[PDB]
Design a protein around this ligand. Structure first.
Ligand code: ATP
Ligand code: ATP
Ligand code: MG
Ligand code: MG
Ligand code: MG
Lengths: 567, 570
């Protein structure tokens, strides 16, 4: 909340941030002076001549007007610091996410990011006023009231100074008693929302496995644990309230004892002690004002912790090189590459080396789980190798600017994921400033023109959340059309035919291999009639390239490729 | 909107613990108002004398009453937060027990970010409305009305000035419930719109890193959300501050001190009658401000309660709709479609009049072009969509009369998109039967040719997989073929299941599925026409209607639509 929230505000606002902590100190000083000026006023309003309480009402009015003005100004400068922290952090997170390492997004580092970019709303524009302004005001008020009570008599000054350590200790112990139950409730809430999202996403499997009724759901257990965590939090929060009440009571007792003693001995008159009672009521109010702000304090602590954990994620490595006018139909090449996944078994690849010629189709066949969609991800640049080098057109791909290395590849993923929207929106997501000539070309090559002419509102049909409003083949053809509408001179096609039927796949293969634009195409395939064109096959097995060559000579020498399809 | 309909039928079981928390919150605020009617009797008692035996027992009865009123006020706001944490659960446990039987068309229209919101952030938006809404509205009526009645009988002149701040407060609080009432519903359309973007921005991350311009629709629906928060909270926090400066106890303490020094300096008043004001005219501000700051929450809890009741009234998949009888013509485990007609949108149809029937121990194929109603046929056999014309009778009884807990113990399903839950590698194979002891999960994995691979994870059959954090796509469906081998069902519907499998590891999975299902009923949707050469009956299905059925040796040797879907690929 401090030294944490201060890290979020930018530097251009570090000229009106140190001028906001002054108008708050002057605000609480005006409030304290206006509260204290009641004791000389009521002491002359009870005396022989009450007409000498006019010169003590001008000062009270001055203090009150100054308090009004200062509070309005700090409530106007407050929201201007929320609208400048929310904007800054949201844009920073949105810009940071596409650069974080792909192995950072675990099951628990994804809920954190989703909450950071989805939950942080009116509670980032409204902590600069709501949380911190009343909190610091209430913290400062007793001490300033005591320093202002010092001129009347020093005994009350030192009797009211003794009250603020009590409030500080009560705050500390209240926040330290509930702290574990609070973080447990936070974890339980996060797990519940993650289970709810999973239950809403993979619903057909859960239904077909009859795991949807809360008696046996995977989300029913999360809800039960969330309820127990919140009940434990409610139970653990009350010691803080009892301790705040005790602090209030004993500070009031100290103040009242000092006031009674000073009245009896002969220092204060009776008209003065009555005003001191009102002064001490105003003194005690902050004690009951902080008890409400403590829980919100812990909540914003958790929120800022999430935002900071997202903003301090390990970004992918990137140099400073660029291209020579993009590439120019480049030559991909592996240089003793070796890559193992973060959480898993040993290395997928280990010392794989080959050189792809420029402007040639190349197939990559092999058993299941033998390191193919990881070779494509290493070529694309979605994964940095853990040893060796990937050289596109000669220039190591990891010594290129982050925006100049995601523009040399257009990938067709194995599991197509379209975004929520229409079909043309997804197709134009690759190249938004495209004409209709290249759009029609892309959509015709991928056999999506007939899909559009076969749908009621084609080219505008909603495509569900991922592709849920489309069949498994239509979603894949939309993905192919999207990947063909990009000027990247490398076409990494993944399986990209698993769902298409026999006469759609032949058309798609012929059209994709009869592209006007010259590219360096790489095809991963499990079907034999899906390559049919590649002039070089790479039979990767277990991570090694067992053997390579042209299709016209791999099936004449008895090897893995010859008998990989006979049975 | 201030309507309570559909928000009074929902939160109806809290009928009584709201009338009892209204007489226990207008009785607690009379106990937090007692110390200040004693500080007033002690203040007018000091001025006169009253030897210390009388000042002891009005000073000690006002420092004990403070503690007592602060203690039996946290005992009520704790009993209220308990019967609300207990009701939010009893309500959001009725939600995910109601929408566990809605048609899947209700899920593929909201998404996953508008369903998570409905359950989590909509049962949490009723907090204020439940716990601290009646206490705050029953204290802000009995404290001010009564602390302003007692003060008009001691001196009407000074108590007539204290209406100055009350009149300024009533205008600033009435030009607020008016000004921000479209922006309480306009802000619920942004929450469920940012949840969807957050969902589709973390899951489709490999796509945003290649194409880049796909994050445009998220970075442009974010400068608008920020621009909506900015001009919603900017004019609201100013009126929430002008409403506190007028209701603050430092404003009444100045007004009183300024109008009482006018009536005592001119000898009109006596300074001993100001004492009832200094301690009492500053209390009701907190109550007024508390009820005023809590109208946004009170109005959001009526939108949440209206969205939660329009959902708990939906039309679900009833389990008695229309059975003919459980017998007379069809053996167990034989499925029968007859004149089935379905369409996802009301106007457009997807399947049109398919007949078709699966025999007890034979294999059917269901081939055809892409996007031509095959996964839809399997889906509405799984009773996800409740067909619109014609019946479906698995075993002789309409599936609209099976308990959906006896239906899924007859039919098994291997879906076309292999989705697996966030658990270990053995909580994803034993999902239908969670208690396959340990050596039935291993046999299922052995039959689906994935045992050797699963025994290679960091810690074997106990590795937490989750959403694609292991198990490459070609072998995260062989883990869903094992999930359907374990928990054997008399009729198994295999979708495109060997799509991601090489033709050396699909010949073993489809060979350890010919030995298991020698007496089961199979329907194996396929696009590789060479795997299903030996099926008992192949049925082509294009544009939602059967056009050809036979044994593939009659199909390729008599007619077309298959002799030109098989010749394109040989
Ligand atoms: N996200 C991941 N985290 C950890 N390990 C993974 C991940 N994805 C794949 N693996 C492992 O890395 C190995 C290489 O997987 P890869 O994706 O290359 O398989 P594949 O060749 O695409 O399989 P298929 O051809 O059947 O789709 C696999 O054995 C798999 O178990
Ligand atoms: N949730 C949905 N909402 C609206 N329309 C849908 C939905 N799911 C599918 N459709 C439409 O219904 C039609 C039938 O699609 P279906 O999923 O049956 O294809 P399929 O024949 O199984 O395809 P493939 O064999 O290539 O996977 C498709 O054209 C699709 O656009
Ligand atoms: Mg793959
Ligand atoms: Mg609360
Ligand atoms: Mg399908």
């Amino acid at each position: 909340m401090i030294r944490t929230w201060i890290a979020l505000v930018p530097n251009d606002h570090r000229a009106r941030l140190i001028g906001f902590a002054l108008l708050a100190f002057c605000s609480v000083v005006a409030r304290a002076v206006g509260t204290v000026l009641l004791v000389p006023l009521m002491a002359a309003l009870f005396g022989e001549a009450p007409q000498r309480a006019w010169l003590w009402l001008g000062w009270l009015s001055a203090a009150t007007v100054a308090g009004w003005v200062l509070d309005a100004v700090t409530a106007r400068i407050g929201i201007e610091l929320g609208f400048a922290v929310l904007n800054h952090t949201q844009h920073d997170v949105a810009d940071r996410l596409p650069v974080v390492r792909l192995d950072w997004f675990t099951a628990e580092n994804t809920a954190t990011a989703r909450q950071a970019i989805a939950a942080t709303g009116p509670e980032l524009v409204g902590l600069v006023v709501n949380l911190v302004t009343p909190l610091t005001s209430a913290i400062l008020l007793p001490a300033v009231i005591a320093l202002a009570l010092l001129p009347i008599s020093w005994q009350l000054g030192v009797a009211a100074l003794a009250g603020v350590p009590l409030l500080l200790g009560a705050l500390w112990a209240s926040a330290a008693f509930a702290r574990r139950a609070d973080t447990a409730a936070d974890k339980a809430n996060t797990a519940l929302t993650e289970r709810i999202i999973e239950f809403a996403r993979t619903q057909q499997a859960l239904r077909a496995a009859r795991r949807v009724e809360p008696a046996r759901s995977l989300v029913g257990n999360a809800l039960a644990s969330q309820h127990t965590a919140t009940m434990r939090l409610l139970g653990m929060q009350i010691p803080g309230q009892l301790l705040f009440s005790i602090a209030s009571q004993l500070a009031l007792i100290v103040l009242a004892g000092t006031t009674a003693a000073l009245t009896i001995t002969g220092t204060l008159t009776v008209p003065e002690a009555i005003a001191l009672i009102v002064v001490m009521v105003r003194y005690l109010e902050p004690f009951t004002a902080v008890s409400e702000l403590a829980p919100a304090l812990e909540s914003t602590r958790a929120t800022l912790g999430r935002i900071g954990s997202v903003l301090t994620a390990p970004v992918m490595v990137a140099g400073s090189g660029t291209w020579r006018d993009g590439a120019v139909v480049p030559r991909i090449e592996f240089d003793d590459v070796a890559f193992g996944y973060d959480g898993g078994s040993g290395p997928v690849l280990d010392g794989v080396s080959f050189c792809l010629q420029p402007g040639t189709t190349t197939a990559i066949v092999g058993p299941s789980g033998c390191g193919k969609s990881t070779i494509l991800a290493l070529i694309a640049g979605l994964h940095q190798p853990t040893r060796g080098r990937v050289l596109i057109d000669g220039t190591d791909v990891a010594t290129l600017d982050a925006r100049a290395q995601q523009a040399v590849c257009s990938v067709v993923f194995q599991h197509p994921y379209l975004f929520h929207g229409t079909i043309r929106d997804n197709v134009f997501a690759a190249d938004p400033g495209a004409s209709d000539d290249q759009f029609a070309q892309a959509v015709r090559l991928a056999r999506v023109d007939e899909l559009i002419a076969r749908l009621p509102d084609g080219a505008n049909t909603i495509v569900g959340e991922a592709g849920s409003a489309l069949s498994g083949g239509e979603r894949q053809r939309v993905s192919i059309a999207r990947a063909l509408l990009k000027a990247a001179p490398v076409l990494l096609v993944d399986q990209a035919t698993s769902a298409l039927d026999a006469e759609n796949e032949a058309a798609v293969v012929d059209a994709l291999a009869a592209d006007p634009r010259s590219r360096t195409r790489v095809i991963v395939a499990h079907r034999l009639a899906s390559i049919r064109h590649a002039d070089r096959v790479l039979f990767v097995d277990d991570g090694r390239v067992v053997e390579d060559g042209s299709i016209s000579e791999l099936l004449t020498a008895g090897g893995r490729f010859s008998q990989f399809w006979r049975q | 909107s201030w309507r309570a309909q559909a928000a009074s039928r929902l939160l109806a079981p809290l009928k009584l613990p709201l009338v009892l928390s209204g007489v226990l919150a207008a009785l607690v605020t009379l106990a937090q108002l007692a110390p200040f009617v004693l500080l007033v009797e002690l203040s007018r008692l000091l001025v006169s004398g009253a030897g210390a035996h009388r000042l002891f027992t009005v000073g000690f009865a006002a420092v004990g009453l403070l503690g007592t009123g602060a203690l039996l006020a946290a005992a009520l706001t704790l009993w209220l937060h308990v019967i609300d944490a207990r009701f939010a659960r009893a309500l959001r446990l009725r939600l995910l027990s109601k929408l566990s039987r809605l048609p899947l068309g209700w899920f593929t229209s909201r998404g996953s970010g508008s369903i998570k919101k409905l359950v989590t952030d909509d049962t949490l938006a009723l907090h204020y409305l439940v716990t601290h809404a009646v206490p705050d509205a029953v204290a802000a009526v009995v404290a001010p009305v009564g602390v302003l009645v007692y003060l008009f009988v001691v001196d009407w002149r000074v108590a007539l000035v204290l209406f100055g701040p009350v009149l300024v407060y009533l205008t600033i609080t009435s030009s607020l419930t008016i000004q921000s009432g479209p922006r309480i519903v306009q802000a619920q359309r942004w929450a469920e719109k940012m949840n969807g973007e957050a969902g589709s921005y973390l899951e489709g991350q490999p796509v945003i890193r290649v194409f880049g311009a796909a994050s445009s629709s998220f970075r442009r629906r974010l400068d608008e959300y920020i621009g909506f928060l900015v001009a919603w909270q900017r004019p609201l926090a100013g009126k929430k501050t002008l409403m506190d400066l007028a209701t603050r106890p430092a404003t009444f303490l100045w007004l009183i001190a300024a109008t009482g020094t006018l009536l005592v300096a001119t000898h009109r008043m006596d300074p001993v009658n100001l004492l009832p004001f200094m301690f009492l005219g500053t209390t009701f501000g907190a109550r007024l401000l508390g009820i005023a700051y809590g109208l946004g929450g009170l109005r959001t809890g009526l939108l949440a309660a209206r969205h939660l009741q329009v959902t708990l009234d939906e039309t679900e998949l009833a389990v008695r709709e229309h059975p003919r009888e459980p017998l007379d013509g069809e053996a167990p485990a034989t499925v029968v479609f007859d004149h089935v007609t379905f369409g996802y949108r009301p106007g457009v149809p997807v399947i049109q009049d398919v007949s078709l029937t699966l025999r007890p121990g034979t294999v059917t194929a269901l081939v055809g072009p892409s996007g031509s109603g095959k996964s839809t046929l399997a889906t509405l056999l799984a009773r996800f969509h409740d067909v619109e014309r014609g019946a479906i009778r698995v075993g002789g009884q309409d599936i609209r009369s099976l308990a959906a807990d006896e239906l899924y113990t007859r039919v098994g399903f291997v879906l076309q998109e292999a989705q697996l839950v966030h658990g270990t590698a053995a909580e994803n194979i034993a999902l239908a039967v969670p208690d396959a002891p340990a050596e039935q999960v291993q046999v299922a994995a052995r039959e689906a040719q994935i045992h050797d691979r699963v025994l290679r994870l960091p810690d074997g059959y106990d590795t937490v997989l989750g959403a694609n954090s292991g198990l490459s796509g070609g072998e995260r469906q062989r883990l869903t073929i094992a999930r359907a081998i374990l928990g054997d069902t008399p009729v198994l519907i295999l979708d495109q299941a060997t799509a991601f499998a090489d033709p050396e590891s699909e010949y073993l999975v489809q060979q350890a599925l010919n030995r298991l299902t020698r007496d089961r009923t199979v329907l194996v949707i396929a696009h590789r026409l060479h795997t299903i050469t030996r099926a008992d009956q192949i049925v082509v299905l294009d544009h939602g209607r059967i056009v050809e059925r036979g044994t593939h040796e009659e199909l390729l040797a008599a007619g077309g639509r298959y002799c030109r879907l098989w010749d394109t690929g040989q």
